[PDB]
Design an enzyme around this catalytic site. Structure first.
Site, PDB file in Angstrom:
ATOM      1  N   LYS A 189       0.828  -1.195   0.000  1.00 11.13           N
ATOM      2  CA  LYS A 189       0.000   0.000   0.000  1.00 11.13           C
ATOM      3  C   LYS A 189       0.863   1.247   0.000  1.00 11.13           C
ATOM      4  O   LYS A 189       0.593   2.202  -0.737  1.00 11.13           O
ATOM      5  CB  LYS A 189      -0.935   0.007   1.211  1.00 11.13           C
ATOM      6  CG  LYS A 189      -2.022  -1.010   1.150  1.00 11.13           C
ATOM      7  CD  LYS A 189      -3.003  -0.849   2.310  1.00 11.13           C
ATOM      8  CE  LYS A 189      -2.340  -1.036   3.675  1.00 11.13           C
ATOM      9  NZ  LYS A 189      -1.877  -2.422   3.858  1.00 11.13           N
ATOM     10  N   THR A 190       1.926   1.241   0.806  1.00 11.39           N
ATOM     11  CA  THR A 190       2.687   2.463   1.009  1.00 11.39           C
ATOM     12  C   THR A 190       3.480   2.837  -0.238  1.00 11.39           C
ATOM     13  O   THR A 190       3.465   3.997  -0.665  1.00 11.39           O
ATOM     14  CB  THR A 190       3.594   2.311   2.223  1.00 11.39           C
ATOM     15  OG1 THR A 190       2.773   2.246   3.390  1.00 11.39           O
ATOM     16  CG2 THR A 190       4.481   3.512   2.344  1.00 11.39           C
ATOM     17  N   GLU A 218      -3.749   5.135   1.527  1.00 11.94           N
ATOM     18  CA  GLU A 218      -3.742   3.742   1.962  1.00 11.94           C
ATOM     19  C   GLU A 218      -5.112   3.357   2.493  1.00 11.94           C
ATOM     20  O   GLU A 218      -5.707   4.097   3.280  1.00 11.94           O
ATOM     21  CB  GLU A 218      -2.715   3.516   3.081  1.00 11.94           C
ATOM     22  CG  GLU A 218      -1.261   3.593   2.705  1.00 11.94           C
ATOM     23  CD  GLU A 218      -0.346   3.277   3.880  1.00 11.94           C
ATOM     24  OE1 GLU A 218      -0.858   2.952   4.974  1.00 11.94           O
ATOM     25  OE2 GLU A 218       0.892   3.356   3.713  1.00 11.94           O
TER      26      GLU A 218
END
Ligand SMILES: OC[C@H]1CCCCN1c1nc(Nc2cc(C3CC3)[nH]n2)c2c[nH]nc2n1
Length: 304
Positions: free
Chosen positions: A112-113, A156
Site C-alpha cells: 500500500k505504502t 492507503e
C-alpha cells in the site's frame, strides 16, 4: 455541523486532518499540552488553539476528534459526551476527507505504502500536487500550500482499520489479499475476502477498480465486482501488463502494454517484481485519469 475540535491537535496524524478541514472551510479548534511549530502553522491557517485541557475548550464544537480512544480522564471528552457532542476517532475523520476530493484508495495487504507514493509522484509530475496519506500521516509536496488543496486525495486503505468500509473513493486499487488480518474478521479468510468485495462495492458505478490479477484471490473475486475494472499484472491475460523486464544497476526497466495504446518503456528505481507491480497499478490509474506518458515516465523514474 460547522466546528471541529481536536483533542491533542499537535501530535499524531491529527494536525494534517485539521489542516485539510481548514482547507474545506470548516471552523477548526484544538487543544494540546504544549505549543509547537505545528500548532503555530495551524493557527496561521485559521485554527483556534488551546494550550492545556479544560472542558471549556470543547465549547462551540459540533464534533470532537480524538487520536486514540475516548478517555474519561480528559475533561474535554467528558464534557462532549455529556452534551451528546459526537466524539469520533482520528482514523474515521481521516477516512471521510475522501468524500470531498477525487479519492484514490490503495488497498491490499502488502504494498500500500509504495503504491500510494508512486501514484502521488506521478500525479505530482503531472502538475496535480496531490495530498496523500501514508501511515496515517497526510503529505504533499507543496510545503507552503495547505494540505487538501489538490483535487486529488491518495490514501492507503487498510483492511484491519475500522473505517475500511467507510471510504468513498473514485478509484480503488487492490494489490493483493493476504491472511495477515484474519483476526479482524473472526479469524475467517473467506470473511476477509468478502470484505474486499464489499470495499470495492463502495465505488460508484462510474468508479474504477484496479485489480492485480497476479494474486489468485484477487482473481477469484473479480467476477463479483459489479464496477468498471482494469486488471494489471505480469499475467498474460491482464489488461495492463509488464514485459521485457531487465536491469541497469538498482534501476529496473520494463515495457508496459495498455489497451489501445502503444508499448511504453518505463523504469523504476527500486528492485523486485513487486515494485514492477506497484508501477503497473500506478500506470493504470494515471492512464485512466488522462495523465501524459511523459509525466508517468518522470514520476516513476524520479521516485527515490
Ligand atoms: O501476493 C503477491 C504479494 C504478496 C507479498 C508481496 C508481493 N506481492 C505484491 N506486492 C506488491 N507490492 C509491494 C510489496 C511490498 C513489500 C512487502 C514486500 N512493497 N510493495 C504489489 C503491488 N501489486 N501487486 C503486488 N503484489
Amino acid at each position: 455541523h460547522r466546528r471541529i475540535h481536536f483533542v491533542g491537535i499537535g501530535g499524531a496524524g491529527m494536525c494534517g486532518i485539521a489542516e485539510v478541514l481548514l482547507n474545506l472551510g470548516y471552523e477548526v479548534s484544538g487543544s494540546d499540552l504544549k505549543a509547537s511549530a505545528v500548532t503555530e502553522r495551524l493557527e496561521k491557517f485559521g485554527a483556534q488553539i488551546f494550550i492545556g485541557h479544560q472542558a471549556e475548550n470543547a465549547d462551540g464544537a459540533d464534533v470532537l476528534v480524538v487520536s486514540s480512544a475516548i478517555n474519561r480522564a480528559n475533561p474535554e471528552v467528558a464534557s462532549a459526551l455529556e452534551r451528546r457532542i459526537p466524539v469520533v476517532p482520528r482514523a474515521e475523520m481521516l477516512a471521510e476527507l475522501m468524500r470531498y476530493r477525487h479519492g484514490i484508495a490503495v488497498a491490499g495487504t502488502h504494498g500500500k505504502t509504495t503504491t500510494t507514493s508512486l501514484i502521488a509522484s506521478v500525479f505530482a509530475a503531472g502538475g496535480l500536487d496531490p495530498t496523500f496519506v501514508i501511515g496515517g500521516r497526510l503529505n504533499a509536496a507543496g510545503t507552503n500550500a495547505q494540505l487538501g488543496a489538490s483535487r486529488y486525495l491518495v490514501a492507503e486503505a487498510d483492511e484491519s482499520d475500522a473505517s475500511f468500509l467507510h471510504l468513498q473513493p473514485m478509484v480503488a486499487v487492490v494489490t493483493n489479499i493476504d491472511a495477515d488480518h484474519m483476526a479482524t474478521y473472526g479469524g475467517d479468510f473467506n470473511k476477509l475476502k468478502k470484505t474486499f468485495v464489499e470495499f470495492l462495492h463502495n465505488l460508484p458505478f462510474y468508479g474504477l477498480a484496479v485489480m492485480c490479477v497476479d494474486d489468485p484471490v484477487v482473481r477469484e473475486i473479480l467476477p463479483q465486482i459489479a464496477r468498471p475494472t482494469v486488471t494489471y499484472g505480469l499475467s498474460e491475460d491482464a489488461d495492463v501488463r509488464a514485459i521485457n523486464i531487465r536491469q541497469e544497476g538498482m534501476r529496473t526497466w520494463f515495457t508496459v502494454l495498455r489497451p489501445e495504446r502503444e508499448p511504453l518503456d518505463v523504469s523504476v528505481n527500486m528492485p523486485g517484481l513487486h515494485n514492477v507491480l506497484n508501477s503497473l497499478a500506478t500506470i493504470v490509474i494515471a492512464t485512466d485519469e488522462g495523465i501524459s506518458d511523459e509525466a508517468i515516465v518522470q514520476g516513476l523514474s524520479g521516485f527515490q
